[PDB]
């Protein structure tokens, strides 16, 4: 702010002001609020809580069976070298 003498800035907005209204009042709000609809315990989703496999491992079962059977052919006898 600058004040300049001799033209000085009025020393106030004075008493000639026009009170325009008495509408100043905010009427307090008084209220009762009830949000009470029956609630049912459940919601349907496509899927909740699953941690789906991105790849599975290979998996398997097992079997064996049979017996011990055989047809054989042997090497001929040979002269013994030494000993």
């Amino acid at each position: 702010a600058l004040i300049n003498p001799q033209f000085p800035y009025a020393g106030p907005v004075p008493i000639p002001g026009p009170a325009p209204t008495e509408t100043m009042p905010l009427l307090n709000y008084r209220v009762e609020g009830r949000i009470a609809g029956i609630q049912q315990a459940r919601q349907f989703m496509p899927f909740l809580q699953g941690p789906h496999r991105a790849v599975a491992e290979q998996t398997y079962h097992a079997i064996g069976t049979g017996i011990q059977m055989g047809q054989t052919f042997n090497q001929p006898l040979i002269n013994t070298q030494e000993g």
Binding site: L26, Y29, V31, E32, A36, G37
Partner: protein
């Protein structure tokens, strides 16, 4: 951003100063607003 809300700054009014007024003239006012009420504890429990 700053909803008109009397009780925050006295009564407020929407104003129209007409240049011409024909017979049966009127202003059709449309408002969009928010309004309450107090909340009481929630119901809905299902025993079984």
């Amino acid at each position: 951003d700053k909803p008109i809300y009397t009780l925050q700054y006295g009564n407020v009014g929407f104003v129209v100063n007409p240049k011409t007024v024909n017979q049966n003239a009127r202003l059709l006012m449309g408002y969009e607003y928010f309004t309450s009420r107090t909340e009481l504890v929630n119901a809905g429990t299902i025993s079984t």
